[PDB]
Amino acid sequence: AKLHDYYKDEVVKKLMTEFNYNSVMQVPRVEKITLNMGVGEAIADKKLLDNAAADLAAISGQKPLITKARKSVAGFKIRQGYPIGCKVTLRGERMWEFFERLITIAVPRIRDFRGLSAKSFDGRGNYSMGVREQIIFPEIDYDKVDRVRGLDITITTTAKSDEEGRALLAAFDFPFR
Amino acid sequence: SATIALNKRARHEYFIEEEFEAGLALQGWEVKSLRAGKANISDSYVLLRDGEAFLFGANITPMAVASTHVVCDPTRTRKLLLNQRELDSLYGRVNREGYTVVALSLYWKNAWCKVKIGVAKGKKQHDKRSDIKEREWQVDKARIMKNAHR
Amino acid sequence: PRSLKKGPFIDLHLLKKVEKAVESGDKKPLRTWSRRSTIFPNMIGLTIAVHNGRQHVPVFVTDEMVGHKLGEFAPTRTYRGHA
Amino acid sequence: MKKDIHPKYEEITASCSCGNVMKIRSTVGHDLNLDVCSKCHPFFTGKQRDVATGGRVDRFNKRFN
RNA sequence: CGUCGUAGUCCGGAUUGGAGUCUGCAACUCGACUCCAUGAAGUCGGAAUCGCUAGUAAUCGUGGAUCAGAAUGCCACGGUG
RNA sequence: GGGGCUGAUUCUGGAUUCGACGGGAUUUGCGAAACCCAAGGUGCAUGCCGAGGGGCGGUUGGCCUCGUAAAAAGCCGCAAAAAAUAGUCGC
Ligand SMILES: [Mg+2]
Ligand SMILES: [Zn+2]
């Protein structure tokens, strides 16, 4: 929670002086961080889901929740109640820890990291964004993983717009372009 | 078993060199006729345009006219599904002097029709005589040897 | 190879052109038609469009090419795979 | 939190090639001793022009010019 | 005479980075020689198949023409046998 | 004019025709045609009337060139008319 409090002591002041607010509870706050990993190919091979869950636990110590299918689309040949992918959510201390670790080592990474996309807001400003594989984290071993398991991580916040989320991420030192 | 109309005359009429197990591409009302429906594979040969070695000679009888919108053409040029790796023989050793590749037979492979193709050439009525003479001569030599050695 | 005491084989004209480029301070490429000529250290920092018949291929000569021929950097055949 | 089902949680030193020392706690197990990080990446810590260069004179200008 | 002892071998000498040398105004495409360094493949090889009847098969080296150099190709020569 | 059985390689509700041929032409490096937007060079370039154009004529009028306006030259058609048939099979 070191970065948590260190940056929360300053984002409040900066946002309050910038957006012309009237209270401290109306500032955009980081509710949680939600990260899943689509392993939908596990229809024939269920071991892929287990490997993805192990990789996710190694990245952040927790137990991934298997989100079973609900509509069972024929296009992908899936049935409802079958393991398709796995998700996880981090709140508070875990959310801040994951945010710090993820941003710090993901800034120096695979391909011409000239910042990240500034148009990746989900309408309200919860900033879903994707990372290609799991070898990004030193948590995951380089030459021991069977495949690559990226992550579609959403920084679920309280932002009422996209510019407020951009300002909050820039204060949190996000790689914006 | 799963065999369908075959052209065994072309085996005697040509010198089969190599064979291809490539498949055939056909439209509706024809694959059902392959089960029953009087398909005939006579006068079968490839008609390479650029990479489109269609089988040209085949008469498959349409057994119904219940869909009276599409025009029926029993002499349609049927497309052929062959690997590009093995299609090099067909764009290669065909147009030297008289080389052809003809459809020897047609059968089923797990509800899918496979037409066997073969590279060959003509005989000019003098290779046929030599083949028949040798076929008879081996039999005659075996018979006379058996009779002599009792 | 050549005898150590004979010397390099830079062209009459190429030397004049590179001298013109180096005291004029121009960033435009200098096109050359010679292909068996050697390299001199004074061309470091210039763009040379060398001709092989197809295109004037550019060379941004580094400080790591003096003792060889400039033509090694520009092949003439066109092939990067059978298929 | 639940019982001992969640994996390892121990402090690890995030020492990079440059002079950065961190007290991260994660599950990698052994000490990190990692490599070039955000604090030494050309994204914003300088090197916006120093990403690639025209070689470096070594023993080439020797014995003849 | 010594030596090695049946082993990818002190066999096998190719590919590789660099070094000079012969050579012809110039060897990145494109020479050969050199020696230091990595030291590949290969361990008598299916169906088939070719050459030889005597100083010949088979092995060893040398010589000759082409040409500034660039022969496992070509033409010759003898020794063993 | 009526009923009845087949239009089903499963009569077994889950077929990569293995293959060529359309697909976001999903994907990884990359050439201004898989493209692309104010700085070192310092020359007479941008809108300017233009000039009718390669053997011949024409192009969205600024796709060629300039310096006081022009020869047009970078693409299409006239042109490059030879594209017309597995094999066996009258002389
Ligand atoms: Mg000569
Ligand atoms: Zn670092």
Question: Which domains does chain A carry?
Answer: 1-177 (3.30.1440.10)
∠ CA(C37), CA(C43), CA(C7), 5° rounding? 40
∠ CA(A9), CA(A126), CA(A88), 5° rounding? 95
C-alpha dist (Å) from residue B43 to B26, B57, B114, C29 = 18, 5, 18, 66
Instruction: Report residue B106 as tokens.
Output: 């047609």
Q: DSSP labels for D1-65?
A: --STTS---EEEE---SSS---EEEESS-S-----S-GGGSTTTSS-SSTT--S----SSSSS--
Q: For residue A83, report the phi and psi dihedrals to the nearest 5 degrees.
A: -65, 115
Burial B49-70 (b: 16+ CB within 10 A, else e): eeeebbbebbebeeeeeeeeee
C-alpha dist (Å) from residue C41 to A29, C19, C65, D6 = 61, 12, 8, 64
Cβ atoms within 10 Å, residue B22: 17
Return the closest-CA partner of residue A135 out of A121, A145, A125, A127: A145
CA-to-C1' span, C3 to E13 (A): 30
Q: Alpha-carbon distance A120 to A110, whole Å?
A: 20
**C38 SS3 class:** strand
Burial A27-44 (b: 16+ CB within 10 A, else e): bbebbbbbbbbbbeebbe
- Contact map slice: A 68-97 vs D, CB within 8 A: 97
Subunits next to A (3 or more Cβ pairs <8 Å) are D
Query: Which residues are A86's β-sheet partners?
Result: A37, A66
**C3 SS3 class:** coil
Widest distance between CA atoms in chain D: 75
- Could you check: is the Cβ of residue B70 within 7 Å of any atom of nucleic acid strand F? no
**C18 SS3 class:** helix
Element (H, E) at A153: strand A151-157
Residue where the block lists tokens 């004037």: C56
Q: Which ligand is nearest to the CA of A107?
A: 2
A101 touches chain D (CB under 8 A): yes
CB A108 within 8 A of CB D37: yes
Amino acid letter, A151: L
Give the CA count within 13 Å in the CB-facing half-sphere of D64: 14
Q: Alpha-carbon distance B111 to B99, whole Å?
A: 32
Element (H, E) at A167: helix A162-171
Write A7-14 long-range contacts (CB < 8 A, 24+): A7/A171, A7/A172, A10/A171, A11/A168, A11/A171, A11/A172, A14/A167, A14/A171
D56 closest CB neighbour out of C41, C60, C63: C63
Instruction: Report residue B85 as tokens.
Output: 């790796």
Q: Alpha-carbon distance B50 to B90, whole Å?
A: 11
Residue where the block lists tokens 């981090």: A90
Q: For residue B39, report the phi and psi dihedrals to the nearest 5 degrees.
A: -85, 140
Return the closest-CA partner of residue A127 out of A56, A34, A64: A34
Sign of CA dihedral D14, D17, D18, D19: positive
The sheet with strand A151-157 has its strands ordered as: A65-68, A83-91, A30-37, A151-157, A128-131
Residue of A nearest to D34 (CA): A138
Contacts of C27 (CB under 8 A, 6+ apart): C47
CB A86 within 8 A of CB A36: yes
Question: Is D65 within 8 Å of C64 when comparing Cβ atoms?
Answer: no
Return the closest-CA partner of residue D26 out of D5, D41, D11, D6: D11
Element (H, E) at A19: helix A2-19
Residue where the block lists tokens 């690559």: A148
CA-to-C1' span, B61 to E9 (A): 73
Q: Alpha-carbon distance A88 to A52, whole Å?
A: 12
**Cβ-based contacts of C40 with chain D (< 8 Å):** 65
Interface of D with A (CB under 8 A): 5-9, 14, 24-28, 32, 34, 36-38, 40-41, 43
**Chains D and C contact (Cβ–Cβ under 8 Å for 3 or more pairs):** yes
Ligand 2 midpoint to CA D19 (Å): 8
**A173 SS3 class:** coil
Return the closest-CA partner of residue A151 out of A88, A81, A101, A104: A88
CB B46 within 8 A of CB B53: yes
Segments in chain B forming alpha helices (H): 9-13, 31-35, 88-91, 127-149
Q: Alpha-carbon distance B91 to B94, whole Å?
A: 7
Return the closest-CA partner of residue B41 out of B22, B59, B63: B59
Experimental technique, in short, is: cryo-EM
DSSP B39: E
User: How would you classify the pairing of strands A65-68 and A83-91?
Assistant: antiparallel
- Could you check: is the Cβ of residue C5 within 7 Å of any atom of nucleic acid strand E? no
**Cβ-based contacts of D64 with chain C (< 8 Å):** 4, 8, 67
User: How would you classify the pairing of strands B39-40 and A83-91?
Assistant: unpaired
Give the CA count within 13 Å in the CB-facing half-sphere of C75: 4
**C77 SS3 class:** coil
Question: Is D61 within 8 Å of C66 when comparing Cβ atoms?
Answer: yes
C-alpha dist (Å) from residue B19 to A144, B24, B92, B121, C81 = 46, 15, 15, 13, 29
CB C7 within 8 A of CB C27: no
Instruction: Report residue C46 as tokens.
Output: 């210039």
Cβ atoms within 10 Å, residue C47: 16
C-alpha dist (Å) from residue A129 to A94, A102, A176, D2, D53 = 19, 12, 12, 30, 33
